[PDB]
Nucleic acid binder design. Structure first.
Lengths: 290, 75, 25, 104, 95, 254, 27, 125, 48
RNA sequence: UGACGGAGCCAGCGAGUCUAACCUUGGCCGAGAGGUCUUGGUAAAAACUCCGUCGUGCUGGGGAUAGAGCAUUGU
């Protein structure tokens, strides 16, 4: 349960035991944007500002298994499909998201369109492997069924502010942040259940973790630009439990996964260049026969 | 020994034959441990990318790439 | 003075050390 | 939403063109007359990270590195880190020996 | 290319009838101007400038010549003949 | 001694040698100043290719940053190399740190010759200094220009019937290397003649060279400072200042 | 570059030295 | 005097000598454990006499192998031959003939060069 | 695509060699080698 | 079809009291022959495995030797 951190032109793998960097990926020609692991943790995908998607071995920066020319525009999102280990979803400034097979990466397996501005987040619904959610700066979260044509979404959800991030907290509920608030929606009802505007500045990142050893069973971590990272309880109507204030605008946040079986980290990445990690620690035989 | 008899080479394992063909092209003549290492990493890459048994991928590749009809020049 | 019983040449070959030598400069 | 972060493709340092894609140590090495150890010592003196690229370098750090490279005495870098008429006469002698041996 | 007396020259229909008759080869078979004008046409065609064209020359004596698309063949047959002589004897021509 | 320093004949010889070195291109190739000491009686100590350090109180011949330095170590080389590289005191001090086994494996013959071309100063562990003549070759050892010195790096003392623990002390290492660079050296021989480098032509002034000569005379002729000093027996009959190619110019004629 | 342009056409030193020398000669 | 057996294995200039005596399970090659036999890429050639028959056949014996000559490949083949032959000989001398025959059948079915030396002598035509 | 002019010599002779003083000196070394080899062979034949 | 360091690790032939460079700066001893010392310049298992680091391309890679231009450093 190590963690990957993306800065300008560099991806660093930090060890969870020592909180020190153990691996460094510095092959990228321009600024690298998103780095992610497979579900099995064997491959690491990174997206570049030149439109490249480079898939490395997770613990070997020397060997590059795959290099995809996904776009001419910068690719801001690279994610692996959670249900399927063969699918890589990339979202770029072409306003087109592309599903690739890892085996044959010469053409996109599927192209999802219908976004008018800057898709910079996507997510996979846990129970349904056919569903893909894309969040864009026009404010619409578009759900695509990959078994269909996929050029047009099956439905869309209107988060009025430009959507910074989308996450799926259950098979039915998703949470989208953009603007000062975040909104949690039901997918079957296509209606928002809750919205929390607890922040001053725009909510940048979301994380969700459940069944980890805690009094509270599920937790939603929301990081905004006012330096605040706050915890919300999905069982308690997404109310507010705890918060941290940092020295500057927090672009990214993460919490160590549920099966950490060791030290637990809350990690924040600020716009100033700082990375803040806060941790929770975890006679002889004759005499014996006598 | 697989060169003593005409069809003895069919009894050779096919991964061994792939390694022996990887020792070709001159610069690495005889570097069989290097070729075995290349096969090991190749099978790891195949299994990682395809989530299959890489021996089966090798077998399918050989059976597909074996040509079934050919030509010969006639004087 | 130093002595190594294995190596007799250490006593002539040793460079003299001084406080100016053990100084940051 | 306003996010302001705190790069040049080509850098002209000490009348030498360097690329911002390479690291600071790589750029100082590509600058002629400077070895890898000298570049590492210069980077350590200027306190710039060796892993940092040349494009993402502070202007004050670049000025300090330029001053250190310009003044080796002020930088106090060690010198250890700083680092055929005869054939024509032979042909004439061969000709003379050939003549004398042919006479012999 | 053939050696006269000493000058190496590319064999010509017009300028080397005596040499062709002495060697016994017919004079009508010595036509490098066709290859010259075909090279001019191919390399000046817009597909070459678009970069979608490659040219190989297969001589009657069995020599195979690869033509880089960026070469500029001289427009005059005299300079073409000199270039072909140096190419056939040195095996390559640089820029 | 004091008369040797205060004699104007020695100073006039020094200007004469400097002017001759400037005028003559063959002498202009040379750059070092040697004195040739005529000991009165035979020294009686066999040469062992071990340089013995003569202190220079007034001035320093060289700084350790100026020279190119090769360190040759005993060969669990990881501890010594890593300590000297990581520690800031000795980080830039050594141009190259190598073990004796790695040196034998890497450098052979002409590669050894270009090594001699590259490196100006060679120092080594005293435990491998005796193994060095076969590894470095003879063309290091002939002429005594770049004979490897003996440094002790751990500061521990070997005791009989017990092991000696291996550490590396960078402060002790830089202290010994500073002493070696600032001080001149001699190697004893059996006969009467001795040769000691006293100054460098470009980097030293004439009074500095004369003071170095005076200090060398006092250290060698002094009855104390045994066994590094006190090796001259019967006094000094005559000293002869000369470079590598220049003829000997006599001073302190007795 | 070319657009149908066609290919372009073609003191003390000597005293001590002489003292050593004539000392050897005298011997 | 414990029950002990000495056997030999050859491949080119390499020669391995195996002493198989009554013991507890120590399998050592050149005074070092069998799990450090180099190269890594060829360690399973040394392992396969153990793995074909089972570690239970090795539960009550001690094998000590001393190898000289040859190179890495030759030495690996000499080791595995000596170990297989030493197993067969110990199970024939101090364990049953049925155990010996079953071991010989397993080793012969996998690779006869574990048991019989592979001699590549010239054949003039 | 770019266009590059070929580098060729008019009146090319493969037999003839292609600064100038150094080339003359090198031709003189070649002549010295031929003469030395020929004289060596002649001297050996006379000796036999 | 790499380079650069570290570490790990494996041969078989070969045993005549016989095996082995040149010039050079000087000091001293000696009637000499020479001896001794000093100086300086030239001749003369690998693989393989493992770990780390650089990085792969007409995006020519090198080698000069002169000259020019502009500046460092400057009486």
């Amino acid at each position: 349960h190590d963690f990957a951190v993306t800065s300008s032109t560099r991806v660093q793998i930090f060890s969870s035991r020592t909180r020190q960097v153990i691996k460094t990926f510095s092959r990228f020609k321009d600024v690298v944007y998103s780095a992610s692991f497979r579900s099995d943790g064997k491959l690491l995908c990174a997206g570049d500002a030149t439109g490249l998607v480079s898939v490395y071995d997770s613990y070997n920066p020397r060997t590059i298994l795959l290099s995809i020319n996904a776009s001419t525009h910068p690719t801001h999102v690279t994610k692996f499909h959670t249900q399927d280990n063969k699918i890589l979803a990339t979202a770029s400034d072409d306003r087109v998201t592309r599903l690739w097979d890892i085996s044959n990466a010469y053409e996109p397996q599927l192209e999802l369109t219908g976004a008018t501005d800057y898709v910079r987040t996507l997510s996979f619904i846990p129970a349904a492997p056919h569903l893909v959610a894309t969040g864009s700066y026009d404010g619409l979260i578009r759900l695509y069924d990959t078994r269909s044509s996929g050029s047009t979404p099956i439905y869309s959800l209107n988060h009025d502010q430009p959507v910074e991030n989308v996450i799926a907290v259950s098979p039915t509920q998703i949470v989208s942040c953009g603007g000062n608030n975040f909104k949690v929606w039901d997918l079957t009802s296509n209606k928002k259940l809750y919205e929390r505007g607890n922040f001053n500045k725009a909510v940048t990142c979301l994380d969700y973790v459940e069944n980890f050893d805690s009094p509270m069973q599920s937790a939603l971590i929301a990081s905004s630009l006012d330096g605040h990272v706050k915890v919300f309880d999905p069982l308690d109507n997404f109310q507010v439990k705890f918060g941290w204030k940092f020295s500057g605008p927090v672009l990214s946040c993460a919490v160590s996964p549920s099966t950490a079986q060791g030290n637990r980290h809350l990690v924040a990445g600020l716009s100033s260049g700082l990375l803040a990690i806060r941790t929770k620690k975890k006679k002889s035989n004759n005499f014996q026969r006598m | 020994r697989y060169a003593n008899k005409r069809f003895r080479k069919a009894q050779c394992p096919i991964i061994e034959r792939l390694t022996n063909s990887l020792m070709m092209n001159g610069r690495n003549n005889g570097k069989k441990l290097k070729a075995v290492r290349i096969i090991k990493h190749t099978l790891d890459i195949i299994n990682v990318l395809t989530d299959q048994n890489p021996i089966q991928v090798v077998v399918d590749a050989i059976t597909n790439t074996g040509p079934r009809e050919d030509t010969t020049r006639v004087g | 003075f130093v002595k190594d019983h294995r190596y007799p040449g250490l006593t002539p070959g040793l460079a003299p050390v001084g406080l100016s030598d053990e100084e940051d400069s | 939403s306003l996010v302001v972060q705190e790069f040049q493709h080509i850098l002209r340092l000490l009348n030498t063109n360097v690329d911002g894609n390479i690291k600071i140590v790589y750029a100082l090495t590509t600058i002629k007359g400077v070895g890898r150890r000298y570049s590492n010592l210069v980077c350590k003196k200027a306190d710039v990270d060796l892993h940092k690229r040349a494009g993402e370098l502070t202007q004050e750090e670049l000025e300090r590195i330029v001053q250190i490279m310009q003044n080796p005495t002020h930088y106090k870098i060690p010198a250890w880190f700083l680092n055929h008429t005869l054939a024509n006469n032979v042909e004439s002698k061969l000709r003379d020996d050939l003549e004398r041996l042919k006479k012999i | 290319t053939h050696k006269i007396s000493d000058k190496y020259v590319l064999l010509n229909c017009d300028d080397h009838q005596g040499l062709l008759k002495k060697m016994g080869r017919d004079i009508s078979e010595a036509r490098p101007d066709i290859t010259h004008q075909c090279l001019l046409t191919l390399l000046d065609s817009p597909i070459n400038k678009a970069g979608k064209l490659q040219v190989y020359i297969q001589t009657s004596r069995g020599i195979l010549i690869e033509v880089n698309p960026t070469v500029r063949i001289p427009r005059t047959f005299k300079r073409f003949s000199g270039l072909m002589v140096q190419l056939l004897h040195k095996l390559s021509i640089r820029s | 001694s004091n008369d040797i320093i205060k004699s104007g004949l020695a100073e006039k010889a020094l200007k004469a040698l400097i002017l001759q070195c400037e005028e003559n291109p063959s002498l202009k190739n040379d750059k070092d100043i040697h004195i040739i000491i005529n000991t009165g009686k035979k020294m009686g100590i066999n040469r062992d290719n071990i340089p013995r350090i003569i202190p220079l109180t007034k001035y320093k011949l060289f700084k350790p940053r100026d020279l190119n330095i090769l360190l040759i170590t005993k060969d669990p080389s990881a501890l010594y190399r890593e300590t000297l590289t990581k520690d800031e005191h000795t980080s830039e001090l050594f141009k190259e740190i190598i073990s004796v086994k790695n040196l034998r494996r890497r450098f052979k013959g002409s590669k050894l010759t270009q090594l001699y071309k590259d490196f100006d100063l060679v120092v080594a562990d005293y435990r491998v200094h005796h193994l060095l003549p076969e590894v470095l070759g003879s063309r290091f050892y002939h002429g005594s220009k770049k004979l490897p010195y003996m440094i002790r790096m751990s500061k521990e003392v070997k005791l009989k019937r017990q092991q000696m623990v291996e550490k590396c002390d960078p402060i002790y290492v830089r202290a010994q290397l500073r002493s070696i660079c600032k001080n001149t050296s001699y190697i004893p021989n059996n006969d009467n003649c001795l040769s000691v480098r006293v100054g460098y032509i470009q980097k030293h002034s004439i009074p500095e060279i004369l003071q170095n000569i005076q200090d060398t005379i006092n250290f060698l002729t002094d009855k104390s400072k045994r066994p590094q000093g006190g090796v001259i027996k019967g006094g000094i009959i005559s000293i002869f200042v000369k470079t590598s190619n220049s003829t000997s110019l006599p001073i302190y004629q007795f | 570059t070319d657009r149908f342009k066609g290919d372009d056409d073609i003191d003390y030193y000597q005293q001590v030295q002489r003292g050593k020398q004539d000392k050897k000669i005298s011997r | 005097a414990v029950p002990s057996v000495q056997t030999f294995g050859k491949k080119k200039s390499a020669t391995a000598v195996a002493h198989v005596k009554a013991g507890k399970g120590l399998i050592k090659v050149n005074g070092s454990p069998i799990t450090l036999v180099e190269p890594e890429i060829l360690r399973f050639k040394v392992y396969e006499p153990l793995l074909l028959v089972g570690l239970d056949k090795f539960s009550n014996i001690d094998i000590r192998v001393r190898v000289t000559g040859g190179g890495h490949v030759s030495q690996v083949y000499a080791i595995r031959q000596a170990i297989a032959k030493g197993l067969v000989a110990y199970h024939q001398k101090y364990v049953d003939e049925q155990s010996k025959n079953e071991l010989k059948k397993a080793f012969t079915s996998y690779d006869r060069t574990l048991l019989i030396a592979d001699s590549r002598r010239p054949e003039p035509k | 695509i770019p266009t590059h002019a070929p580098k060729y010599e008019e009146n090319f002779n493969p037999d003839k060699k292609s600064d100038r003083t150094r080339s003359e000196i090198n031709k003189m070394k070649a002549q010295l080698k031929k003469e030395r080899k020929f004289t060596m062979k002649e001297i050996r034949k006379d000796a036999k």
